[PDB]
Amino acid sequence: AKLHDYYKDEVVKKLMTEFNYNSVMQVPRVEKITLNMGVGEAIADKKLLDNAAADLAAISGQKPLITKARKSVAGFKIRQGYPIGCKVTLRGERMWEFFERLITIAVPRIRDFRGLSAKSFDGRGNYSMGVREQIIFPEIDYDKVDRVRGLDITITTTAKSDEEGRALLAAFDFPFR
Amino acid sequence: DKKSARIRRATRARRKLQELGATRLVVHRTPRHIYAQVIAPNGSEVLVAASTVEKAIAEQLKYTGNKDAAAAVGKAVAERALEKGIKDVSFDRSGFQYHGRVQALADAAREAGLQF
Amino acid sequence: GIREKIKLVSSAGTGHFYTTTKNKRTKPEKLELKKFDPVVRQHVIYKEAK
Amino acid sequence: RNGRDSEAKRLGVKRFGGESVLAGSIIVRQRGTKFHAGANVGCGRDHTLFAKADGKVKFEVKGPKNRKFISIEAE
Amino acid sequence: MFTINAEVRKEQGKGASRRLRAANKFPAIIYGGKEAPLAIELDHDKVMNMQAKAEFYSEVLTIVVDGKEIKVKAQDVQRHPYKPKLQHIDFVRA
Amino acid sequence: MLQPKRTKFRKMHKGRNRGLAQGTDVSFGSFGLKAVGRGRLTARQIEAARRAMTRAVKRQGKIWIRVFPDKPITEKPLAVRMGKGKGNVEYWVALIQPGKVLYEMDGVPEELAREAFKLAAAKLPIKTTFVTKTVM
RNA sequence: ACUUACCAACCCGAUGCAAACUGCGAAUACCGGAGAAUGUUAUCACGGGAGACACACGGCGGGUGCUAACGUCCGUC
RNA sequence: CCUCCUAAAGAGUAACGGAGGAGCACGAAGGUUGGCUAAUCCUGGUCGGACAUCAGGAGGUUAGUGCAAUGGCAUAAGCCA
RNA sequence: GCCUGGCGGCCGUAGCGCGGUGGUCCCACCUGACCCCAUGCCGAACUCAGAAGUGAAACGCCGUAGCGCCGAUGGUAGUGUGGGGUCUCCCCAUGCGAGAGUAGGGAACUGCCAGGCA
Ligand SMILES: [Mg+2]
Ligand SMILES: [Mg+2]
Ligand SMILES: [Mg+2]
Ligand SMILES: [Mg+2]
Ligand SMILES: [Mg+2]
Ligand SMILES: [Mg+2]
Ligand SMILES: [Mg+2]
Ligand SMILES: [Mg+2]
Ligand SMILES: [Mg+2]
Ligand SMILES: [Mg+2]
Ligand SMILES: [Mg+2]
C-alpha cells in the first residue's frame, strides 16, 4: 500500500512531464506483478515442485498456481499435462507490498550487484528478467532451504512503447545499469 | 476484452427462444445503471420496457445501479407487461451471471405476478 | 471382449435386471446405480458387477 | 493388399425445397451439419433432419457463416 | 497515331465470333468512362501487323467506326493459343 | 532426370488430355519454345531436349523449363496375365496441350535462340514452334 | 568467436500440374409444384401363368491394359 | 464391416481398380447446469538448450475431436467443472 | 431532427488498415472490497457497494482506396440436342454458357426502443 500512494502524488505528475502527456489516464500505470518458477527437472524428482511451491508462499502469501507441459515432446523426455512450473498473479495491496519486498530489502542484497541491464522491454513496455538465488527475500531465512532454487520475474504494463517503459520505472528509481 | 465475452456467453439461450418462438425478458447491466426490456420472438419490436434512465422510478432510488435499483427496475417491468397484456416469458440474462442485481430484477418480476 | 457382461439386480426384490459391461481389471468394485423398476414404478438402487 | 470399400449409405436429400411433407418425414441424411435445422425443423442423433410440422420444405442461407438451413412453413 | 477501321457487331457470342474468325475477322470491344460499351468487329490482317511494333500498346490509337472516331488505348489482348493471330482485344476509352 | 520428389499417391487414373493450355506467353525470358501438337512428355525426352540447347550455347544463357513431369506412368511387364493389379511405376510424364510454353531462353541473340531451340525439336514427340516475348 | 564457387524451409512477387485438393463454377440430369396440348391407361394396386440372372457391337463418360486388341469391367443411349 | 475414390454435380453402380481402417473403448471419454478457447512466426526473460516454464504483440481452428477416412464442429460436437 | 445505450433484420459493396474523434446524457475503464459471488493463484474476470477522475484503452461516428470485398461488357474453355472430319482430339447448326482477369462500384442499408441535444 505504501508504493500505490507514492506513485500517485509524485510519479503521475512527473511522467506527465517527459513527453508532456495531455491526459492523466494516458500515463502508463503499473497494473500487475507475476511470479513464476520453472522447475523443468521435476519429471524425475516429483517432489521438486512441492518444494518450489512453498518457496513462493513466503514471498507472497498467495498460494501458487501450477503450470502444465501442454505440448508433449520427446525432445525433453516429457509427458503432457504433468507439472513443470508454478506461477502467482499479484494485483492491488500485495502487488504494491511485494514490489516493496523487491527493491528496498533484496536489491541492496543482490549477489555481485552493479545494477541491472535495461535492454529487455520486448518492444512494448513490459519488463522481464531473473534471479539465481531466492534467499534474498527476508521472509525466507537461510537455515530453511533444501535447494539452490530460483525464479524469473516478469512485469506487465500499460505503456505502448519501449521508451514509455523506461520512464515509468525510472520514476520508481529502480537501479538500472 | 470485457464486453465481447458476455455477448457470446448468451447466444445459446437466445437460439432456443428462436426455435421455441419464445418471448424473452432481456436485461442489460452496466456499472453505472441497470436496464430491462421486453422483446417479441421476432426480436425487433419492444412491447414493454423499463429502466433507470427514466426519470420516474430512478431518482427515488439511492443509486441507479444497486440491487434495490435492480429490484425497482424488476418490479416495474412485470406490471407494465400486465398493463398491456403480456404475461408468460423467459428471462434472458444476456450473459451476466444470474446473481447480484440480475437476480433482484428477476425475483421482483416473479413476485408481482409474472410467470417465468 | 476384455470387458465383461454384468447383471444389475434391483435392490427391491423385483426380478428385473439390467445388463451392461465393465472393465473388471481397471474397475474392480461393485457398480451401483439408480434405475427404473417397471414393477415397483420408481427409481430404485441397483447392485452387482460380476 | 487392397480390395475393400464400404456400402453406400443412401444419404443425400430426400425432400427438396418446395415439397409437401408431413411431420416426422426425413428431409436429409448427412454426416456433419452440411445443412442445419431452421425454424420448425428438428435434428436427430446422426444429424438426420426431419420435419416437426406438416408443410413445405424451404432451403435458405442465413447468418454470418452462410450455412444452409432447412425449415418448414405450414401451408 | 494508328487508325483502325471498324464496323459495329450485329450479333454476339461464341458462334458469331468463331464464324467471324472463320470469316478472317475477329471481335474486339470498347469500354470506359461514362458511356456504354461498344461491340465492334475488326479486319484481322490489319491489326495483327499494327501490334507488331511496340508503339501500338502505348500510343492513343484512333478507331473509325461508321465514319466517326473513338479515341481508345489497347488494354488487354487475347491472342490465338498457338498460331500468330488474335481472338479478341479490349480497348478503353481513356 | 526430372521427377517429383514425392507425391501423395504412387499410381494415377489414366485420365485425359482435353482442352487448351494455360502457359501461352513467354513469361520469364525473351524467347520461347512452345508446344503445338498435343501429348505426353517423358522425363527422358525433356532431359534429352534440355541438353541439346545447353550443348549449343556453351555455359552461356539462362533456360527455364515451364512443364514438369508430375504424372506417373505405369506398365505391366512381359508375360503377365491381365487384371491382378495396376502396374509398377516405370517413368514420369507431363501432359502437354497446344500452346504450353515448354522452354524459354534469354541471353543469346534471337537468331541463336531459334537455332538452339531448334536442335531440340528433333527430340520431342510433338510438333513445336519458336515464339518470342511480346509487349503486353 | 568468422567466413562460406555449398545446401537452403518460411516469407514475397511472378508460373503450370492434381481421380482420392476447392475461397469459384456450369451444361445435363433428378426431385417437387401447377398448366394446354397429344398419348390404344402408356400410370398405380392387387392377384393368376411364366421366361430370365453366358450377352455382343457402336456413340459417348471412365477404371484397366500400351487412349494395344474381334481385350476387359461399369455407367448410359 | 467401415471411410474416402473411380461414381459421368439426386440415390445406386463394376473389376484380382486406387489409398486406409474395424472384430475395441468409456460409470464418465455418459445427462445436465454454469463457464472456457486452439496451431504455429517475431521479440524479451533464472539454470533456456532449435523447441519444458512466465510475458508481449503478430496469428486466427492449419488445434482439437479415445482411433481410419469423410462431412461436421465457435451457440462450439473441442476444453473444465 | 442530430447523437449514445439496448434488441434484431440483411449476412463481407456490411471487414480490416492508417489517420482524426466524442463523454452533459448514455457506454467505457474506473475508485473501495467487510458481506450476496468470486479466482484449478490474483477483486483481471465473476462482482457487490460506488461517481473522485478520465477519453488514455477500448467502445460509437467520420475521412481515407495500401489489402480484402462487390466485379460488368466483350471473349475464351466446357456443354445438352443434330450432324460432321484428320475420330487419343477437335469442327459446323442450335440453345445454355464459365472461371480467372479487365473498365468499374467500394469506407454499408435498415426497423424498433430508450435516453440526451434543438
Ligand atoms: Mg458449338
Ligand atoms: Mg448423375
Ligand atoms: Mg392392365
Ligand atoms: Mg448366376
Ligand atoms: Mg443360356
Ligand atoms: Mg467381347
Ligand atoms: Mg456390360
Ligand atoms: Mg453420386
Ligand atoms: Mg526465445
Ligand atoms: Mg481515444
Ligand atoms: Mg465473369
Side-chain angles (χ1 to χ4, degrees), chain A, chain B, chain C, chain D residues 2-75, chain E, chain F:
Chain A
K2 132 148 169 216
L3 268 199
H4 188 194
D5 305 310
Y6 144 81
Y7 171 71
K8 296 174 222 173
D9 71 341
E10 289 185 19
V11 178
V12 171
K13 128 64 188 51
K14 178 67 184 52
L15 305 178
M16 283 283 294
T17 328
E18 326 179 308
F19 301 106
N20 61 62
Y21 296 68
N22 281 323
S23 176
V24 58
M25 238 288 151
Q26 188 197 332
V27 69
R29 47 179 189 276
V30 28
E31 178 196 320
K32 61 182 188 80
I33 291 175
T34 19
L35 310 0
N36 169 241
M37 280 175 120
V39 73
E41 67 187 293
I43 68 178
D45 345 273
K46 306 292 293 105
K47 59 195 178 180
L48 187 57
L49 190 52
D50 308 332
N51 295 284
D55 214 300
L56 264 190
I59 285 166
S60 77
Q62 256 180 240
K63 98 220 78 189
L65 180 77
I66 328 173
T67 56
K68 275 75 183 179
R70 172 167 73 69
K71 194 50 50 235
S72 210
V73 295
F76 301 149
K77 304 167 225 171
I78 51 182
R79 269 248 304 99
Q80 136 182 346
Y82 250 93
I84 202 81
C86 58
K87 114 189 193 178
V88 190
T89 317
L90 307 176
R91 328 183 95 121
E93 215 72 344
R94 258 191 260 151
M95 170 192 83
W96 286 115
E97 290 172 285
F98 173 88
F99 193 36
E100 202 180 2
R101 279 186 244 119
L102 181 66
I103 9 174
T104 316
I105 47 186
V107 167
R109 292 210 301 161
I110 291 156
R111 182 177 78 111
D112 306 358
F113 186 51
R114 292 285 193 175
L116 308 325
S117 173
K119 254 189 200 55
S120 52
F121 283 100
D122 65 275
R124 291 277 160 91
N126 319 293
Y127 187 73
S128 189
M129 62 171 282
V131 324
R132 305 157 132 277
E133 200 79 304
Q134 88 296 18
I135 305 159
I136 66 170
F137 294 78
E139 280 149 300
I140 313 171
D141 35 304
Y142 178 89
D143 309 82
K144 284 299 149 130
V145 295
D146 288 9
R147 179 65 88 155
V148 225
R149 219 162 32 235
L151 58 78
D152 58 323
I153 322 265
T154 296
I155 306 175
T156 308
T157 207
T158 70
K160 322 93 178 61
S161 316
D162 46 321
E163 229 183 22
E164 295 172 40
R166 191 148 31 215
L168 177 61
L169 293 166
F172 284 100
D173 225 14
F174 203 101
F176 282 177
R177 225 239 60 68
Chain B
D1 203 38
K2 184 100 148 294
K3 185 67 151 41
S4 40
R6 175 165 55 74
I7 295 157
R8 73 178 226 307
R9 205 199 289 137
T11 293
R12 190 172 193 102
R14 278 201 175 80
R15 297 286 342 230
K16 290 301 75 162
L17 290 3
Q18 195 156 103
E19 173 221 283
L20 291 170
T23 303
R24 43 179 224 285
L25 162 58
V26 178
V27 60
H28 187 251
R29 192 199 74 215
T30 263
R32 195 174 301 154
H33 295 287
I34 197 165
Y35 309 80
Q37 28 203 296
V38 187
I39 303 173
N42 61 34
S44 280
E45 49 132 319
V46 4
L47 265 292
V48 175
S51 154
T52 45
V53 74
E54 312 182 8
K55 86 150 205 300
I57 293 294
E59 248 175 356
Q60 319 184 349
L61 297 178
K62 177 184 186 307
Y63 180 68
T64 47
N66 65 8
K67 268 181 291 189
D68 290 325
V73 164
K75 174 170 175 168
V77 225
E79 297 167 271
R80 291 184 179 174
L82 296 183
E83 300 172 341
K84 274 261 239 178
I86 306 295
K87 179 178 209 177
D88 153 77
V89 299
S90 335
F91 200 77
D92 173 293
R93 74 251 165 89
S94 300
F96 300 99
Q97 280 200 348
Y98 187 81
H99 171 47
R101 343 208 211 155
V102 219
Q103 178 178 37
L105 186 152
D107 288 341
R110 286 199 251 255
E111 264 194 10
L114 210 60
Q115 271 69 101
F116 74 86
Chain C
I2 320 173
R3 206 164 222 280
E4 322 193 350
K5 286 89 77 124
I6 62 157
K7 28 192 174 283
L8 310 173
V9 174
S10 178
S11 73
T14 311
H16 180 97
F17 60 100
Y18 282 80
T19 169
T20 184
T21 74
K22 203 194 187 201
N23 186 338
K24 147 218 162 62
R25 310 166 316 284
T26 78
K27 296 296 163 257
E29 73 288 357
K30 294 293 126 183
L31 176 56
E32 274 223 291
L33 286 165
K34 284 224 190 171
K35 304 245 141 179
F36 183 78
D37 179 308
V39 177
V40 198
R41 292 178 58 212
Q42 305 268 350
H43 265 299
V44 212
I45 318 95
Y46 270 77
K47 224 170 291 175
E48 175 79 358
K50 293 262 168 315
Chain D
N2 226 132
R4 288 168 317 274
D5 203 350
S6 66
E7 243 152 341
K9 292 295 172 59
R10 283 90 220 266
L11 308 169
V13 170
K14 300 305 154 106
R15 302 299 160 185
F16 297 79
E19 195 152 344
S20 102
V21 299
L22 296 182
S25 296
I26 286 162
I27 298 157
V28 217
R29 309 211 82 143
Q30 51 181 358
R31 280 298 163 70
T33 60
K34 256 177 157 205
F35 301 94
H36 294 262
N40 226 268
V41 168
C43 183
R45 49 166 303 175
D46 61 355
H47 305 270
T48 299
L49 304 192
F50 63 90
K52 289 177 79 187
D54 289 30
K56 279 195 298 107
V57 174
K58 174 75 184 148
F59 290 76
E60 342 180 31
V61 177
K62 286 207 161 320
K65 301 218 181 116
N66 297 340
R67 355 197 83 168
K68 289 88 178 209
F69 286 81
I70 306 188
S71 40
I72 278 195
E73 300 172 27
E75 183 51 30
Chain E
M1 69 135 288
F2 294 96
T3 300
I4 296 150
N5 282 284
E7 264 118 40
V8 193
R9 288 179 77 198
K10 64 140 92 294
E11 298 174 40
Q12 84 77 49
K14 154 154 48 173
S17 306
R18 290 238 273 264
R19 282 192 292 272
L20 271 133
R21 300 193 197 96
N24 194 20
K25 321 155 170 275
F26 72 97
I29 195 201
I30 295 173
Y31 51 83
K34 68 174 260 260
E35 312 78 351
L38 180 67
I40 4 250
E41 89 79 343
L42 300 176
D43 181 307
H44 181 287
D45 303 281
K46 294 269 172 51
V47 183
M48 210 40 223
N49 290 339
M50 276 176 169
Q51 61 86 96
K53 325 76 166 56
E55 287 83 298
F56 186 105
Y57 295 90
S58 96
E59 290 192 350
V60 180
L61 332 89
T62 334
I63 309 183
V64 176
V65 9
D66 326 315
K68 290 115 195 201
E69 286 191 88
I70 315 221
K71 269 164 79 184
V72 296
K73 286 183 160 203
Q75 169 71 12
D76 169 271
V77 49
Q78 308 185 359
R79 243 184 288 270
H80 194 276
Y82 59 92
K83 305 177 97 185
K85 5 174 93 166
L86 293 157
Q87 299 282 99
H88 186 269
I89 299 179
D90 291 325
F91 300 100
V92 170
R93 293 192 180 82
Chain F
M1 216 174 76
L2 292 89
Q3 133 168 2
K5 296 172 81 259
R6 183 210 161 277
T7 65
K8 270 162 160 230
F9 298 107
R10 272 155 81 199
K11 301 183 186 331
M12 204 184 272
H13 282 155
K14 199 70 68 53
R16 301 291 145 92
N17 190 30
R18 293 267 283 281
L20 301 294
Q22 310 287 325
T24 294
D25 294 27
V26 168
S27 329
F28 299 78
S30 286
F31 319 110
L33 185 54
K34 173 178 282 189
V36 167
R38 186 182 304 286
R40 15 188 59 174
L41 289 185
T42 69
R44 291 177 180 275
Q45 279 156 9
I46 298 175
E47 243 293 305
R50 187 200 67 76
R51 287 183 195 167
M53 353 176 133
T54 319
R55 185 116 288 278
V57 300
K58 295 354 165 188
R59 42 75 122 193
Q60 306 158 228
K62 189 161 218 47
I63 289 179
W64 290 262
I65 301 183
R66 301 274 312 274
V67 292
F68 193 95
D70 184 278
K71 185 182 172 60
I73 303 305
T74 32
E75 296 180 346
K76 279 181 133 48
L78 208 112
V80 160
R81 316 251 193 209
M82 298 284 136
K84 315 291 191 298
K86 181 172 181 82
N88 294 310
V89 183
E90 302 293 68
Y91 62 100
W92 300 80
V93 308
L95 292 182
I96 304 301
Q97 303 84 29
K100 207 328 157 323
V101 175
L102 304 181
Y103 301 86
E104 288 177 28
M105 175 182 289
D106 187 39
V108 293
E110 196 189 307
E111 183 288 316
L112 177 57
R114 305 184 86 115
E115 240 258 290
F117 280 160
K118 204 53 44 189
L119 294 207
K123 308 302 184 186
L124 304 179
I126 64 181
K127 286 193 142 50
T128 63
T129 186
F130 185 96
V131 293
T132 50
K133 153 208 74 86
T134 66
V135 182
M136 150 156 166

